[PDB]
Design a protein around this nucleic acid. Structure first.
Ligand SMILES: OC[C@H]1O[C@@](CO)(O[C@H]2O[C@H](CO)[C@@H](O)[C@H](O)[C@H]2O)[C@@H](O)[C@@H]1O
Ligand SMILES: OC[C@H]1O[C@@](CO)(O[C@H]2O[C@H](CO)[C@@H](O)[C@H](O)[C@H]2O)[C@@H](O)[C@@H]1O
Ligand SMILES: [Mg+2]
Length: 580
DNA sequence: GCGATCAGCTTG
DNA sequence: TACGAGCTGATCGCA
C-alpha cells in the first residue's frame, strides 16, 4: 500500500512544526559540496516532500532549519549538516539521529541506511537505499515520483522509530551516551570535516619526483639481482623469482602461490640481497601510490584542502574511522614516510599546527578497570611502563633492563591489551608457544589484578552476552560460547580488548566535546582538524599557542577521572611533521 | 567491459 | 600478522 504525502510546490507553516522527522537527501557517498536531491518532512500535520531548489531558497524554511528550538529527528545528520554547510546553511536542533542510535544498540548490525535500522524493530515499510539508487556504475537518482515516496517513507520510519529506539537505549543505560556524547560529537566532526586540512601540493609533487627517481634506481637494482625484469608488484610473479629462480626458502604460503608478506621477506633478508631491495621498493611504492598520487587525487583544486569523512558509526569498539582520504594512517614510523606530513600545513597565514596525544591511555584504562595495584602504582609514579614491565617479568633492576628486554616486554603489553594468547605473542616475537606462555605466566604473576580482570571479563561476556565500556558502549559477543576453539578464542580476545580500546575511545570523544566548549568560551580561533584515536590535531594563530599548551592538555586529562592520572603530551610547528 | 576479492601496504 | 581500521595494484570473476 502506497504511502500518502503532499508533493509541495512551496513551503507552508504546517511544514515548520517544532518537532519533525527530517530527510535532506545526499546520494553521493562523499557529501562534501554534494547535491541535495530532495527533502522530506513528517510531523503531526502530515507528510511532505519538497524540492531542494525551492525549500533551500525559502527564508522561512532556512530559518526553521537553523532554529535550535525546532527539533528534528534524522538518520545521519552529519551528512545533511555538512552538505548544508557547503551551501551556507546551518542545521540546528537535531535531537535524535537514528544512525547513531542503531550503532550504539548494536554496532555489529552494520546499519548504514534507514531500512536496516528499521528492520531491528520489525518495521519494513521502507526500501533499502541501494534498492532505490542502485550500486556502482548503475547508481542514479530515480524519477521524482519514486524519489519522493522513498524520502517520505524514510522520514515516516524515523518518525515511528524514535520512541522504540530511545526506550531501548534507556534500558541499556545508553540514553546519555547518545544525547550527551555521540550526537554532540557528530556536530563537532561536521565542523572538522568542513574545515578540512590544507595541503602543500607543490611540496607533495616535488616529493613525488624524488620518489620516482629512487623507485627507478631500486627497480633497476632488483631486475639486475634477479637476472630479469618482472612485475615486482605481482605477488605471483615475485614468488616465482624468489622461491623458484633464486631458490629462497619457502617458510610460508598463501592460497594461489607463495607468501611474500613483509614478515616473510624480513626473515629471508639474510639469504639474498634482492630481498632488502624488494622491501625498500615496496615502502617507496606505497608512499608514491597512496600518500602522494592518491592524496593529490582528493585534494580540492581550488582551496588545496582535503576534506575527510569520519565514519562515526562503523567500528565495533567505538572508534572513528576516516576515508577519502584516510587521515588516520599517514606515515610516521619511518622517516622517509614521515616526511609526507610536511605537506599538511595550516590553512591560514601565521597559523601553526598543534598536536596533543594521550600517553599510554589504553594501559592506564586497563589499570583503572582491573584495579591492579602494581599497574596503578606504576602510572602513579609515571614510570616508563615497558621498562617497568620488563623489570617485573624478568625479575631485574631498572639498570639491568636491556634494550631487547624492554622490546619484548613492550610486545607483552601489546598482547595484554589485544587479548593475550601464546600463539599471538609467539608469532609477534618469533619465539615458541611454550616460551611465549612463560612470558605470559610471568606477566600475570606480576599483575594479578589484570589476570583476575581478564578471567572475569570473559566470564561476564558469557553471562550477559556482551561487554561494555566506561561510558556504557556495548558489544555483543555471541561467539563467546562457540564450541570451536578458534572462533571462541577470537571472541574472548574481543571481550578482553573492547572495554580497553572502547573506553579509550569514549574518553577522547568526551575530550573533544569538552575542548570545543572551552575554545568557544575563550573565543579562541583555534579549531580541531583531526582525531587519530588517541590524539587531537588542531590549527590556530601563532598567537594562541601558549594558551593552547595549557588548555588542550588540561581538557584532555580531565575528560574523565580514573584511579590513575591521564597524561597528555603536546607539540606544535609549521607543519604536521614539525608538530613533534 | 565491469566489479568483487586477494595480498600488500599504512596507522593507533 | 594478535585488537581496531582504509587504500591501491594485481588478478580471478564472469556478464
Ligand atoms: O555519511 C557517512 C555515513 O554513511 C554511511 C552509510 O549510511 O557510509 C557511506 O558514506 C561513507 C563516506 O563517504 C562511505 O565510506 C561508505 O561507503 C557509504 O556507504 C555510514 O557507514 C556512515 O556512518
Ligand atoms: O582455564 C580457564 C581459563 O580458560 C579461559 C580461556 O583462556 O576460558 C575457558 O574456561 C572457562 C571456564 O573456566 C569457559 O567459560 C571458557 O569458555 C573457556 O574458553 C579463561 O577465561 C579462563 O581463565
Ligand atoms: Mg600516544
Amino acid at each position: 500500500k502506497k504511502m500518502a504525502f503532499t508533493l509541495a510546490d512551496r513551503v507552508t507553516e504546517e511544514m515548520l512544526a517544532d518537532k519533525a522527522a527530517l530527510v535532506v537527501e545526499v546520494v553521493e557517498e562523499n557529501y562534501h559540496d554534494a547535491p541535495i536531491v530532495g527533502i522530506a518532512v513528517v510531523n503531526e500535520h502530515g507528510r511532505f516532500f519538497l524540492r531542494p531548489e525551492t525549500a533551500l531558497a525559502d527564508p522561512q524554511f532556512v530559518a526553521w532549519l537553523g532554529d535550535e528550538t525546532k527539533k528534528k529527528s534524522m538518520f545521519d545528520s552529519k551528512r545533511a549538516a555538512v552538505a548544508l554547510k557547503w551551501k551556507g546553511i546551518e542545521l540546528c536542533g537535531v535531537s535524535f539521529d537514528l544512525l547513531l542510535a542503531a550503532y550504539l544498540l548494536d554496532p555489529a548490525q552494520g546499519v548504514d541506511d534507514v531500512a536496516a535500522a528499521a528492520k531491528m524493530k520489525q518495521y519494513e515499510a521502507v526500501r533499502p537505499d541501494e534498492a532505490v539508487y542502485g550500486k556502482g556504475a548503475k547508481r542514479a537518482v530515480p524519477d521524482e515520483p519514486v524519489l519522493a515516496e522513498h524520502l517520505v517513507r524514510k522520514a515516516a520510519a524515523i518518525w515511528e522509530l524514535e520512541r522504540p529506539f530511545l526506550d531501548e537505549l534507556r534500558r541499556n543505560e545508553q540514553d546519555r551516551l547518545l544525547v550527551e556524547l555521540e550526537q554532540p560529537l557528530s556536530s563537532i566532526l561536521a565542523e572538522m570535516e568542513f574545515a578540512g586540512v590544507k595541503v602543500d601540493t607543490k611540496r607533495l609533487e616535488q616529493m613525488g619526483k624524488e620518489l620516482a627517481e629512487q623507485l627507478g634506481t631500486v627497480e633497476q637494482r632488483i631486475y639486475e639481482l634477479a637476472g630479469q625484469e618482472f612485475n615486482i608488484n605481482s605477488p605471483k610473479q615475485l614468488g616465482v623469482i624468489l622461491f623458484e629462480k633464486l631458490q629462497l626458502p619457502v617458510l610460508k604460503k598463501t592460497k594461489t602461490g607463495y607468501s611474500t608478506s613483509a614478515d616473510v621477506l624480513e626473515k629471508l633478508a639474510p639469504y639474498h640481497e634482492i630481498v632488502e631491495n624488494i622491501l625498500h621498493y615496496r615502502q617507496l611504492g606505497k608512499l608514491q601510490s597512496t600518500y602522494i598520487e592518491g592524496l593529490l587525487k582528493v585534494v580540492r583544486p581550488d582551496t588545496k584542502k582535503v576534506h575527510t569523512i569520519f565514519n562515526q558509526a562503523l567500528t565495533q569498539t567505538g572508534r572513528l574511522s576516516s576515508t577519502e582520504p584516510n587521515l588516520q594512517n599517514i606515515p610516521i614510523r619511518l622517516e622517509e614516510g614521515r616526511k609526507i606530513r610536511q605537506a599538511f600545513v595550516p590553512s591560514e597565514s601565521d597559523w601553526l599546527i598543534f598536536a596533543a596525544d594521550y600517553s599510554q591511555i589504553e594501559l592506564r584504562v586497563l589499570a583503572h578497570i582491573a584495579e591492579d595495584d602494581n599497574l596503578m602504582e606504576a602510572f602513579r609514579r609515571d614510570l616508563d611502563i615497558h621498562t617497568k614491565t620488563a623489570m617485573d617479568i624478568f625479575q631485574v633492576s631498572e639498570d639491568e633492563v636491556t634494550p631487547n628486554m624492554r622490546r619484548q616486554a613492550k610486545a607483552v603489553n601489546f598482547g595484554i591489551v589485544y587479548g593475550i594468547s601464546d600463539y599471538g605473542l609467539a608469532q609477534n616475537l618469533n619465539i615458541s608457544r611454550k616460551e611465549a606462555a612463560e612470558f605470559i605466566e610471568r606477566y600475570f604473576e606480576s599483575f594479578p589484578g589484570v589476570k583476575r580482570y581478564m578471567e572475569n571479563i570473559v566470564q561476564e561476556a558469557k553471562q550477559k552476552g556482551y561487554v561494555t565500556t566506561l561510558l556504557h558502549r556495548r558489544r555483543y559477543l555471541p561467539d563467546i560460547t562457540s564450541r570451536n576453539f578458534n572462533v571462541r578464542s577470537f571472541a574472548e580476545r574481543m571481550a578482553m580488548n573492547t572495554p580497553i580500546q572502547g573506553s579509550a575511545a569514549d574518553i577522547i570523544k568526551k575530550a573533544m566535546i569538552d575542548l570545543n566548549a572551552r575554545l568557544k568560551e575563550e573565543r579562541l580561533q583555534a579549531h580541531l582538524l583531526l582525531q587519530v584515536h588517541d590524539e587531537l590535531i588542531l590549527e590556530a594563530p601563532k598567537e594562541e599557542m601558549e594558551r593552547l599548551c595549557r588548555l588542550v592538555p588540561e581538557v584532555m586529562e580531565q575528560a574523565v577521572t580514573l584511579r590513575v592520572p591521564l597524561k597528555v603530551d603536546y607539540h606544535y610547528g609549521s607543519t604536521w611533521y614539525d608538530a613533534k
